């Protein structure tokens, strides 16, 4: 539901982005959660952790909130680029 | 309650309107 | 045979209140 909340909020038009400090605390928790036996056990576990998100539309709440910020170098896009 | 047999039911009333007052009363009165 | 010649007689010619009453005088 939460990833759908940021996807619906990005699809509307406001001719800029608001600051929206819920986005800057859930597109930050969502990115701080991501010798041959280990190099495939710490790899096949990472593919599971990024499957919590990209199976839940989170490859669209970072593909739209770049499209909606037209050229804004604000602190919003510098926190949904750590989710992409 | 059939298929397109109602279509011919409309052709016999729309190509020829009723106008039956010339027929039903005036012909048998002599 | 119901669905035939009425499918033909559309394309043939044969108001008609004027004809049925004026034939009494003729």
């Amino acid at each position: 539901q939460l990833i759908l909340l940021f996807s619906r909020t990005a699809l509307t038009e406001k001719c800029k982005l608001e600051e929206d400090f819920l986005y800057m605390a859930y597109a930050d928790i969502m990115a701080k959660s991501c010798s041959f036996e280990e190099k495939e056990m710490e790899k096949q576990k990472l593919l599971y952790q990024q499957a919590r998100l990209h199976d839940r539309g989170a490859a669209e709440m970072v593909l739209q909130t770049i499209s909606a910020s037209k050229g804004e170098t604000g602190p919003m896009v510098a926190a949904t680029l750590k989710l992409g | 309650a059939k298929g397109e047999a109602i279509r011919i039911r409309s052709i016999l009333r729309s190509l020829i309107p009723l106008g039956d007052l010339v027929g039903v009363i005036s012909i048998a009165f002599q | 045979n119901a669905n035939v010649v009425v499918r033909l007689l559309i394309r043939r010619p044969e108001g008609l209140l004027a004809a049925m009453e004026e034939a009494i005088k003729i």
Binding site: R8, L11, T12, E13 | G3, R7, I11, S14, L15 | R7, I10, R11
Partner: protein, 458 residues
């Protein structure tokens, strides 16, 4: 070669009225008008015919059994015995048969919905050289028969009506490459800033200017390349062929009088070469029978305008009123860039002047009764107008609640575009004049026709 579905085609019937041929096309209007008529394309060298009200799209082609089955519930190639569904290329309404009267012939006009057997027409051959089943060929002459009315698409003596008598119907393919030009589109005359025409409050806007900013975005800068070709008119557009420039917002054809002045003169004042134009590669074949070869890209374009009747180069001089006129050599500024418009921008523009021509027939038609009593003006249309407001309410219908949030914001965005392209053209001012002219009475005139005075006002 053979027609398929998703093809653009026109219907056309021919009449020899006192040793004079007329290859006149079937054409319906839509958006306020629910009836078809004829469009003369025989005199295409002296009077321009309309194109966007006569091109059709073959949506589907089924068998008769499957059609009655569904009614009981790539691209195919059409067969002489399939039943088709034709939709209007502009209005998006399907051509069907109507239960009205204008005998036992029924009238032919568009309609909204597709269900029921009204919107279906079974093709038929009309000569011994063809028969049942085989594939349709281009340029054939054929018959169309309704499914519901069980009649022929007849031309009468000019009531076009579904009758029990036959009439031939020549068909002609029109269209079928993204970014390239296609014959008949509307587009933008980009500079590097676009070509415009003055605003409202009238000069009859007959000048031509270059302006800049969001005025190119609005509904003033729209021009339609109406190509003189009949068949394959929606081919790609190549260098060298002539095409009249039509204004879209007011319907006045660009006709250069380099002797006199730059004029957007009115409809029947378009000859062959007095209004033709072409595009040159520099600034110094003959025919393709098909959809054309890919000539002109959109962003990668520097296109040079040249008249046919003169052969000079329209270039601007030294509000923003750099009015451009024909020069013998010009400068390096005639490398015009191009960009096409969208399909709702083309939709909004056409419905403006389709109504602007109608409301003026209800302003001055009601200013005819602004005297004491003339009573000879029958040009006060009521059923032609009181229908036309119901479409413009439904055109601006706000989107419903129960819809997808990716679909509402599509519908709500296209709604706000329709409200902006009516703002600039003064439609808001144009209705308030009509509320003035009807607020003279208290419930009028001959009160048999205009008894719907309140419902028009409401």
């Amino acid at each position: 070669q053979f027609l398929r579905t998703d093809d653009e085609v026109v219907l056309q019937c021919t009449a020899t009225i006192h040793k004079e041929q007329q290859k006149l096309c079937l054409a319906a209007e839509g958006f306020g008008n629910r009836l078809c008529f004829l469009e003369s394309t025989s005199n295409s060298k002296n009077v321009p015919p309309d194109l966007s009200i006569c091109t059709f799209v073959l949506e589907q082609s089924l068998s008769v059994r499957a059609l009655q089955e569904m009614l009981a519930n790539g691209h195919r190639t059409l067969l002489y015995g399939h039943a088709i569904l034709l939709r209007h290329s502009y209005s998006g309404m399907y051509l069907c048969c109507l239960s009205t009267s204008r005998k036992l012939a029924f009238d032919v006009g568009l309609q909204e919905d597709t269900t029921g057997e009204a919107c279906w027409w079974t093709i038929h051959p009309a000569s011994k050289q063809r028969s049942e089943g085989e594939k349709v060929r281009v340029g054939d002459d054929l018959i169309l028969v309704s499914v519901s009315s069980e009649r022929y698409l007849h031309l009468s003596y000019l009531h076009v009506d579904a009758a029990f008598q036959q009439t031939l119907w020549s068909v002609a393919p029109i269209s079928s490459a993204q970014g390239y030009l296609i014959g008949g589109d509307v587009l933008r005359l980009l500079h590097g800033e676009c070509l415009t025409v003055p605003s409202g409050e009238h000069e009859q806007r007959r000048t031509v200017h270059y302006e800049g900013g969001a005025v190119s975005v609005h509904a003033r800068s729209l021009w339609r390349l109406e190509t003189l070709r009949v068949a394959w008119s929606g081919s790609h557009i190549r260098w060298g062929q002539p095409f009249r420039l039509r204004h879209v917002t007011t319907g006045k054809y660009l006709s250069l009088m380099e002797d006199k002045s730059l004029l957007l003169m009115d409809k029947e004042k378009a000859d062959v070469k007095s209004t033709a134009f072409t595009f040159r590669s520099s600034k110094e074949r003959k025919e393709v029978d098909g959809m054309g070869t890919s000539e002109i890209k959109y962003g990668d374009s520097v296109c040079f305008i040249q008249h046919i009747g003169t052969g000079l180069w329209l270039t601007y001089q030294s509000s923003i009123q750099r009015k451009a006129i024909m020069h013998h050599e010009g400068h390096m500024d005639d490398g015009l860039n191009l960009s096409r418009s969208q399909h709702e921008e083309s939709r909004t523009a056409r419905v403006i002047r389709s109504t602007v021509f109608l409301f003026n027939r209800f302003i001055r038609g009601l200013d005819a009764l602004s005297k004491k009593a003339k009573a000879s003006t029958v040009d006060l249309p009521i059923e032609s107008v009181s229908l036309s407001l119901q479409d413009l309410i439904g055109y601006f219908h706000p989107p419903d609640e129960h819809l997808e949030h990716e679909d509402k914001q599509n519908r709500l965005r296209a709604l706000k575009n329709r409200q902006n392209l009516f703002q600039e053209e003064g439609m808001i001012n144009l209705v308030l004049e009509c509320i003035d002219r009807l607020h003279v009475y208290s419930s009028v005139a001959g009160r048999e026709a205009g008894e719907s005075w309140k419902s028009i006002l409401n």
